[PDB]
Every structure is written in C-alpha cells, then in structure tokens.
C-alpha cells in the first residue's frame, strides 16, 4: 500500500501485467464491498491469461473481477451496493480465502478489448470482519492480471443461468427453482463454476442433459464461499444438448412470499458456468433465463436434491 509497482509493467515482447489495487480504502463496518475500475491500456484485442491475488490476509474474505464497458462509477472507489457495472458485469475471476483459486488451462484466455471485448475491469473486494481499532488503516487489496496480445487458441467465457419466474411462499419447507435452455453454439468445455443465491438457498446443481442422460457439471451449497469451484473432468456441451440447473430454497422463518429475481429483500438463483471454446468459433458470454423443458426435471438425478451442508 506504499508499493511502487506501477499500473502497467510490460513483460516480454507482447505481454503485460496490470496491477489492480484498491486506492487506500478504509472499511468501517463489517461485511463491506468496495468496488473500483481499471480501463484497459490498449484499444485493440487482448487476452487475460493469469491472475495473482494480492489480498490483505487480515480481513479480506472475497475478491471478484469483472469485465464490462460501463462501471457504475468513475470515482476512485465506491460501495458495490451502488452497482458493479451499469451494463453486463461479465465475471472473470473470484477469490475466496481458503478456496482453491482455479487456474486457467494452458492456452485458455479471456478476450477483452477491440470491438466486442470489455474495455474496463471492475474489481470487487469483500471485507468481512474488521477489528475495532486500526487508526486510519489504508488497504490496497486487489489482483494482478496477466494480459497478452498473442492470440490464444482456446477462449474462455461465462455461460450464465438465472431463474426469474419462481416464488418461495412463506414457510414452505422446500422450493425448487428450475432453469433450462437448448444449447445451439459450437462446443464449450466447462472447466469451472460458481453458484449464487441469498440466505434461503440450500444447494445449487448444474447439468448437461444429452439424449435424456444427465451429466453433472457442478453442485454446491451457495452459503459457502462463492469462489469458482473446479470441475474434476471438464464437461463438453455441444449443439442440441440442454443445460439444466436447480436451486433448492426454503421459505422457513420467512413472513411473506420471496421472489427469485433481483433487489435485496429478494432471492437470486444464478449458476455461473465458466468454459472455453476453440478461438474461431468462440464467444465470451451466453445466458439462459428460462425453463424451456420443465417436464424433464421429473427425471433429474436424486443427487440434485440431497443437501450438501
Ligand atoms: Cu445477489
């Protein structure tokens, strides 16, 4: 936080590192999410290929890195409750304390810059428990990013699944939020995933369904750290398969109905599926906001319901 490392350190011929650090912030209460931005130094296309977390051990619980064109603020920093990005927050990295970080496979890179690519990174740093004192304590937590202009042969992106149609009535023991779209692109290979809900979430499970056979992509309690969990053996998703996902909620202790689709006195059901695709057929993001094949869930594997506390 009195370091001298610089915002751009050119590496070999065609690479560079970007040090994305909080500008000396001071978290005052616990559970605080501060956000900041770095613009890419290049207008042309570029490939994020590695990450080094540089977090203050003492207090930082989680870190997220996003790629987007419109950060919710132009200030040196802001509370992330304001928003992350005004446009798509294309999530690229998540670090949790104790979580394994998930390393990109050799030759996989996120595509940024140029025409489609995100022009800004937005870093989100989550501070759990501050101590009482620490007079004026400045913190410069963040991440360094390895960019290269050398074209990568595998491109990574995010397939996002979200539920927006389903209500949790109060006191209802167990409620299933279900999500499914047909896949219609060139092949993706899912190598990681992260889940997200708020406090009524019990388990999130993601599948590839091919000719009525379910293959597990990943499965997790969303009350654990929302880092990216690795997929033991990467699952290939190809044309005509179906992605299906099930969030299990409860409505216990809840007074009125709770809606799964935004705000804060709301719930959410998101599965972030991180993939790669051969560069020439690739795209950086895909979304599913529907349940096209709802009856299919009568055959969901039993593992999808058994909780993982
Ligand atoms: Cu949320």
Curated annotation (Swiss-Prot):
Assigned protein family: In the C-terminal section; belongs to the peptidyl-alpha-hydroxyglycine alpha-amidating lyase family. In the N-terminal section; belongs to the copper type II ascorbate-dependent monooxygenase family.
Entry keyword set: Calcium, Cleavage on pair of basic residues, Copper, Cytoplasmic vesicle, Disulfide bond, Glycoprotein, Lipid metabolism, Lyase, Membrane, Metal-binding, Monooxygenase, Multifunctional enzyme, Oxidoreductase, Phosphoprotein, Repeat, Secreted, Signal, Sulfation, Transmembrane, Transmembrane helix, Vitamin C, Zinc
Principal location class: membrane
Residue segments, region Peptidylglycine alpha-hydroxylating monooxygenase: 1-309
Subcellular location: Cytoplasmic vesicle, Secretory vesicle membrane
An example Gene Ontology molecular-function term: identical protein binding
Secreted among keywords: yes
Name this protein carries in UniProt: Peptidylglycine alpha-amidating monooxygenase
Disulfide bonds: 1-140, 35-80, 68-85, 181-288, 247-269
GO CC aspect terms: cell surface; chromatin; condensed chromosome; extracellular region; extracellular space; neuronal cell body; perikaryon; perinuclear region of cytoplasm
């Amino acid at each position: 936080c009195l370091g001298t490392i610089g915002p751009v350190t050119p590496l070999d011929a065609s690479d560079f590192a970007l040090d994305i650090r909080m500008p000396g912030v001071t978290p005052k209460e616990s559970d605080t999410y501060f956000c900041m931005s770095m613009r890419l130094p290049v207008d042309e296309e570029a490939f994020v290929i590695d990450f080094k977390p540089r977090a203050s051990m003492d207090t930082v619980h989680a870190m997220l890195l996003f790629g987007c064109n419109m950060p919710s603020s132009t200030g040196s920093y802001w509370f992330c409750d304001e928003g992350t990005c005004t446009d798509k927050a294309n999530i690229l990295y998540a670090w949790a304390r104790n979580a394994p970080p998930t390393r990109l496979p050799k030759g996989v890179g996120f595509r940024v810059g140029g025409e489609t690519g995100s022009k800004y990174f937005v870093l989100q740093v989550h501070y759990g428990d501050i101590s009482a004192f620490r007079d004026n304590h400045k913190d410069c937590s963040g991440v360094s990013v390895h960019l290269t202009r050398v074209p990568q042969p595998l491109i990574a992106g995010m397939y996002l699944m979200m539920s927006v149609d389903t209500v949790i009535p109060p006191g209802e023991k167990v409620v299933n939020a279900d999500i499914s779209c047909q896949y219609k692109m060139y092949p993706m290979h899912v190598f990681a995933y992260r889940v997200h809900t708020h406090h009524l979430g019990k388990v999130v499970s993601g599948y590839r369904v091919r000719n009525g056979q379910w293959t597990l992509i990943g499965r997790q309690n969303p009350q654990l750290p929302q880092a990216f969990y690795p997929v033991e053996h990467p699952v290939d998703v190809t044309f005509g398969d179906i992605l299906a996902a099930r969030c299990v909620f409860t409505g216990e202790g809840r007074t009125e109905a709770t809606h799964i689709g935004g705000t804060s006195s709301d719930e959410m059901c998101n599965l972030y599926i991180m993939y790669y695709m051969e560069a020439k057929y690739a795209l950086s993001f895909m979304t599913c906001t529907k349940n096209v094949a709802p009856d299919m869930f009568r055959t969901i594997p039993a593992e999808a319901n058994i909780p993982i506390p």
